[PDB]
């Protein structure tokens, strides 16, 4: 088939990576390296290995958003609600009458 020629099914497997566990082991390796080397805070090693993590964590904990992002808290498609007058109320009363 032409789409069969435009298809790539030469995969072998799925590599599963727990990036949380890998980040934890990376941080543990950084701590182990800094403890074994007994490096001070003014070292470029300590700076490179600590400062960006601390900065990003401090920013992500300081963030106080009055509203959440665009496609998560508003600008969402919603079906129009039933009105308390006109045809919707009549349908509601008819539903109540039929049910009861």
Ligand X SMILES: CCCCCCCCCCCCCCCC(=O)OC[C@H](COP(=O)(O)O)OC(=O)CCCCCCCCCCCCCCC
Which residue ranges make up the site for ligand LMT (CB under 6 A)?
A: 19-20, 23, 56
Q: How many residues does the chain have?
A: 100
The answer to whether the CB of 49 falls within 8 A of the CB of 30 is yes
DSSP 38: T
Residue 20: contacted member of ligand LMT, other proteins, ligand X, none (CB under 5 to 8 Å, by partner type): ligand LMT
- Whose Cβ is closer to ligand LMT: residue 32's or residue 56's? 56
Contact pick of 12, 35, 36, 64 for other proteins (by CB under 8 A): 64
Residue 25: contacted member of other proteins, ligand LMT, ligand X, none (CB under 5 to 8 Å, by partner type): ligand X
Cβ-based burial of 34 (10 A; exposed 0-12, middle 13-18, buried ≥19)? middle
């Amino acid at each position: 088939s032409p789409n069969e020629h435009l298809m790539f099914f030469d995969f072998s497997s799925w590599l599963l990576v727990d990036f949380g566990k890998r980040w934890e082991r990376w941080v543990s390796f950084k701590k182990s390296f800094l403890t074994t080397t007994r490096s001070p805070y003014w070292s470029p090693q300590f700076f490179l290995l600590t400062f960006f993590q601390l900065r990003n964590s401090n920013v992500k904990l300081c963030e106080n958003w009055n509203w959440a992002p665009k496609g998560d808290d508003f600008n969402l498609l919603h079906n129009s609600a039933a009105e308390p007058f006109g045809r919707d109320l009549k349908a509601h009363l008819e539903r109540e009458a039929g049910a009861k």
